[PDB]
């Protein structure tokens, strides 16, 4: 209809068996094995392991496969909204495709590239190549025909169809959804090596021709994302760039003429000038006809990752983390899957306003002092002697560890401090071993606290247990500790004020770091059609105005899926995310500013009862 998409079916690119084994396939006999050609076909390094095909590999494809994806929801997204899209000569647009058919296209995507032997680029090695790639392709549906062609694909003809889209050959283009997410899959993955904004402008156009401005926004702010995932070099944009313009379509230029307008729209190859220049970028992005239609026009894009320099980026760039990428199927999908999956969740984040959040005051010096002696006297225990401690030339008294505990909130020193000073109690302890430690109770007979400890641990996080362990049981302990923070009347050995004070922050610390709801949930409903008939229409209207932005702007709930599906049968399933732990068999309460916000609508068609059930996942966000 006019914005009637129908239900996707859970088919996605990282969970389907098929393609994944379509992309194993191609990389264990194609991509991956080092290029047989001689143009620029020397292996590449990272991290010291190899990648045999840089440009043109397996992260590549996969990107390109998770490209198709993208685009196909971004243009349902688009139809819902209401927008109008570019028409196939079917008729139909991109948010027509059924996951039969993109499952397919990625099946075909999968083998693109794979009949390479260099990087060639001249025309008469093109056709050669990708006449191999459709060889491969061909062979791989024929040796396991069994299980794909009545299954994915239909007969011979489906196949033979979607070989001739990998051939590529100009006289055989249809304009078909295949044909065009091929092509565009693969066209717009060139962002990585290239005057950038001339083009980003044109596949930008390309793609607006289909999807519109804001899948489009949409589709490249996520490209981005593929990239830095994939640890892949993502651009930059600087619409005030003052290098020549070059028009992709041709390899040409514009000549600014001398007059300070263009020519009559023509453009120019290998053309001699008359001190007349060659038209910069910033010109040809402030022109009519672009400022006025492309995105981005009068605005930036910084180069690589926000969070980190240019050497961090360097050795993100130059890490085995490439190589796996490049050269696993799993770690490659599971990168992209990861990121993908996060895309859908962060606009919505960055949509409503930020909840306020939580002040907290910054530690006072003293207790930065407290800190910083505590964490020395348990990396060097050799200062700790009968009355005192003496370090860095000062003799500390056993006052001094007294006020520090009256001056100082120990949880805040704590705070300040680290694992490592953790996992130096046990030095400590080593270096304390006769240390005789009393108790509040006169006739009770002392104890070894560091014999105890290195005793009862041996071979961590529950070494922050145990430590919570001595101080909620072992009164001979707790008893003089609570004694000590608070002024006591008691026979002090220095020693029991200095582990006092070392322990309790190191203990508060351990309580906080032990004291911290599930990821993810599940809701059971019975409903009948009439109310999930509504809550699609619903949910599709609220995941289809929130689109990743790159230049413009009760308890029935469970953990276990079979309990859900199987044990309960329902009708619809609330998946419930919750990575920011926001909620609060099993139950759940929803804050008052605290909202579910659907994300994906899936079906699957298997209740026992013999109707379809719909899974709609949602996410906690907190906003007013």
């Not at 760039?241 to 007059?259: D, Q």
Request: hydrophobic share 35%.
């Amino acid at each position: 209809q006019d914005k009637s998409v129908p239900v996707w079916n859970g088919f996605s690119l990282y969970t389907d068996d098929t393609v994944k084994a379509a992309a194993q396939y191609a990389y264990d006999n194609y991509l991956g094995k080092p290029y047989t050609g001689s143009v620029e076909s020397a292996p590449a390094n990272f991290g010291g392991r190899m990648v045999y095909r840089q440009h043109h590999g397996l992260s590549h494809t996969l990107r390109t496969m998770a490209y198709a994806e993208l685009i196909v929801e971004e243009a349902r997204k688009a139809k819902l909204r209401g927008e109008t899209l570019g028409k196939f000569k079917d008729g139909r647009t991109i948010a027509d495709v059924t996951p039969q058919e993109l499952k397919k296209i990625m099946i075909a995507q999968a083998f693109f590239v794979a009949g390479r032997d260099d990087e060639a680029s001249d025309a008469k090695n093109y056709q050669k190549y990708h006449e191999q790639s459709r060889d491969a392709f061909l062979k791989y549906v024929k040796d396991n025909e069994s299980t794909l062609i009545p299954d994915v694909f239909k007969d011979q003809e489906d196949v033979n169809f979607y070989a001739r889209v990998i051939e590529d050959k100009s006289h055989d283009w249809e304009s078909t959804p295949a044909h065009v997410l091929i092509n565009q899959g693969h066209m717009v993955d060139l962002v990585r090596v290239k005057p950038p904004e001339s083009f980003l402008q044109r596949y930008f156009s390309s793609m607006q021709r289909w999807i519109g401005s804001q899948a489009t926004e949409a589709v490249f702010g996520i490209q981005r994302q593929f990239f830095h995932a994939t640890y892949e070099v993502v651009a930059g944009f600087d619409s005030d760039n003052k290098e020549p313009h070059l028009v992709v379509s041709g390899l040409g230029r514009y000549v600014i003429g001398a007059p300070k307008k263009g020519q009559k729209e023509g453009d120019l190859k290998v053309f001699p000038q008359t001190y007349e220049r060659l038209m910069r970028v910033d010109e040809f992005l402030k022109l009519p006809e672009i400022q006025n239609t492309f995105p981005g026009s009068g605005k930036h894009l910084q180069g690589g990752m926000p969070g980190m320099n240019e050497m961090d980026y360097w050795n993100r760039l130059n890490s085995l983390n490439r190589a796996r990428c490049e050269n696993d199927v799993d770690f490659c999908l599971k990168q992209l899957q990861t990121a993908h999956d996060k895309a859908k969740i962060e606009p919505i984040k960055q949509a409503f306003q930020s909840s306020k959040g939580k002040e907290r005051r910054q530690p006072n010096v003293d207790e930065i002092a407290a800190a910083r002696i505590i964490q020395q006297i348990l990396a060097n225990p050799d200062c700790i002697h009968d009355d005192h401690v003496l370090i860095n030339g000062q003799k500390l008294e056993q006052q001094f560890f007294r006020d520090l505990l009256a001056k100082c909130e120990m949880a805040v020193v704590g705070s300040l401090l680290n694992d490592t000073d953790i996992g130096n109690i046990d030095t400590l302890m080593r270096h304390e071993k006769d240390t005789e430690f009393h108790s509040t109770n006169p006739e009770a007979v002392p104890v070894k606290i560091g014999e105890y400890w290195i005793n009862d641990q041996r071979i961590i996080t529950q070494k922050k247990h145990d430590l919570i362990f001595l101080m909620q049981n072992d009164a001979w302990y707790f008893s003089r500790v609570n004694a000590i923070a608070q002024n006591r009347d008691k026979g002090s050995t220095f020693k029991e004020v200095l582990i006092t004070t070392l322990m309790t922050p190191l203990t508060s610390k351990a309580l906080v770091d032990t004291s911290q709801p599930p990821t993810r949930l599940f809701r059971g409903l019975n409903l009948s059609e009439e109310f999930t008939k509504g809550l699609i229409d619903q949910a599709n209207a609220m995941i289809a105005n929130t689109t990743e932005r790159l230049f413009t702007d009760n308890a029935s709930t469970t953990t276990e899926i079979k309990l859900v599906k199987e044990t309960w049968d329902s009708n619809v399933i609330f998946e419930m995310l919750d990575p920011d732990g926001l909620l609060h068999e099993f139950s759940v309460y929803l804050p008052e500013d605290v909202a579910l916000v659907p994300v994906k609508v899936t079906l699957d068609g298997k209740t026992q009862k013999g109707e379809n059930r719909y899974v709609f996942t949602f996410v906690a966000v907190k906003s007013p």
